Design a protein around this ligand. Structure first.
Ligand SMILES: [Br-]
Ligand SMILES: [Br-]
Ligand SMILES: [Br-]
Ligand SMILES: [Br-]
Ligand SMILES: [Br-]
Ligand SMILES: [Br-]
Ligand SMILES: [Br-]
Ligand SMILES: [Br-]
Ligand SMILES: [Br-]
Ligand SMILES: [Br-]
Ligand SMILES: [Br-]
Ligand SMILES: [Br-]
Ligand SMILES: [Br-]
Ligand SMILES: [Br-]
Ligand SMILES: [Br-]
Ligand SMILES: [Br-]
Ligand SMILES: [Br-]
Ligand SMILES: [Br-]
Ligand SMILES: [Br-]
Lengths: 268, 276
């Protein structure tokens, strides 16, 4: 009936993850959602809690799978999955610490006896969750509060953010520098760039390659509190040359809209 | 004839890099070294400098890094980076422990008309012809770049002595672990040790628990990379671990700091390895 307001869309790209794990700390529940075309749908849910031995919230991806004998069953159960904590939003504010894993624990031990901020589930549960996880790809969203909205409200929020992404893509493809610039925060950073050098490079590229095409696959879209994360397979065509890459934008709320603070690209 | 005191050995493991890049800030030189068995051999050398732009002590980071990604146009501007850039893993685990990290470090080029020092603060900058030559030696994710304010060149005799000294340290650690001599093994670790999921106490408790269950283990290490510079020691090896229950192979990286006349491990990483 209802859908999580902060998970708006799962990417259609099959090299990414068709599943997203959503941890609702207030409900003590971990849910698995799957793409259904442009829609999302809940597949399953399990009890979960946060280790207690404020805890972080954020938008993460699962990276590695660990088990015995590398990690002790007494602390982690049969399996642990690491995350990319601290992410770029976390680093922007110098967040560090022991890290965030999704892991299990012995049956005799409460889930809250896990290490602080880790997501802890039962040993039987982690073995089932492993089947949904594509290492390096599957998101894990860890939120204090999850607002559930009607399907019609969810569709509206998704379309609102889809229009934001499209207006950005269009301004980029048009090489309409004046419009494109407005999507970026003056504190923007990317590897090798600040706001000024990023815009200067975009203007210089336009001077060399007048016509470009930018295509974005149906993206992951997550929007929780101030944060917006969009991840897509991007096709860039310019000067009869082409490249495909994984494009991730990180943005923060700015008045009634958002401004991009970080932009990443990796070859695909 | 002389050899850099800080680069003691290159790993024999072909999944890693047989080449190491060494940057000597004082001499404004970048050299390529290649593994020759247990020895190292300098194969080429070019001018290089450190970028000074957009940086009060006026100094730039130094350390023991690995090259990660290769970038070129149209992703990055030629005006700033010339024909190619290679990113690093800066800040590494040593840098994170010191918690005074700055702007990123790349190895890149620049237009022919401008000085190498126009690069951004701390980057290693070379000419366009040079960066294209270096690309032939760089294995992404594997090739070290050692960025040192100063380089101490020593005799081959002195170099081999230092290499053997550190090899004996590593072997002593390996033997203590393999013997599951917990008293001896513990002496190799700093009390502030951390690894993913562990501190000193939980690391030692896990090792003691494994010992209680699996009486005899085997630990084998491929000939390691060994770098020792300033307070830091980095050892990287392909490790085979065997108990009666399982065998695993993985990449083992040890980060250690000087302690009196020896070293204590502050971080220890393992990543699984497979051919198949
Ligand atoms: Br796709
Ligand atoms: Br991928
Ligand atoms: Br619940
Ligand atoms: Br800030
Ligand atoms: Br944490
Ligand atoms: Br159990
Ligand atoms: Br419980
Ligand atoms: Br898995
Ligand atoms: Br499944
Ligand atoms: Br939500
Ligand atoms: Br304009
Ligand atoms: Br960044
Ligand atoms: Br908006
Ligand atoms: Br891009
Ligand atoms: Br030249
Ligand atoms: Br040296
Ligand atoms: Br660590
Ligand atoms: Br942990
Ligand atoms: Br290990």
């Amino acid at each position: 009936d209802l859908l999580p307001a902060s998970l708006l869309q799962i990417s259609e790209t099959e090299a990414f993850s068709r599943y997203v794990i959503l941890v609702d700390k207030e409900q003590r529940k971990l849910s698995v959602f799957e793409r259904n075309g442009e829609q999302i749908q809940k597949i399953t849910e399990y009890p979960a809690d946060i280790g207690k031995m404020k805890t972080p919230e954020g938008i993460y991806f699962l990276q590695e799978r660990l088990s015995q004998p590398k990690i002790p069953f007494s602390l982690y159960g049969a399996l642990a999955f690491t995350t990319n904590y601290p992410n770029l939003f976390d680093k922007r504010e110098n967040k560090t610490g022991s890290g965030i894993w999704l892991h299990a624990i012995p049956d005799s031990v409460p889930l809250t006896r896990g290490s602080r901020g880790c997501v802890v589930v039962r040993n039987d549960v982690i073995k089932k969750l492993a089947d949904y996880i594509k290492l390096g790809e599957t998101p894990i969203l860890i939120f204090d509060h999850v607002n559930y909205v009607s399907k019609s409200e969810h569709d509206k929020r998704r379309q609102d953010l889809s229009r934001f992404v499209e207006s950005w893509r269009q301004a980029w493809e048009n090489q309409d520098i004046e419009k494109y610039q407005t999507f970026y925060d003056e504190g923007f950073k990317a590897p090798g760039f600040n706001y000024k050098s990023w815009m200067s490079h975009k203007k210089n590229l336009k001077s060399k390659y007048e016509y470009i095409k930018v295509h974005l696959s149906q993206p992951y879209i997550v929007q929780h509190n101030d944060q917006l994360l969009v991840k897509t397979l991007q096709r860039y065509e310019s000067d009869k040359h082409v490249d495909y890459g994984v494009k991730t934008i990180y943005a923060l709320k700015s008045g009634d809209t958002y401004k991009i603070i970080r932009e990443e690209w990796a070859p695909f």
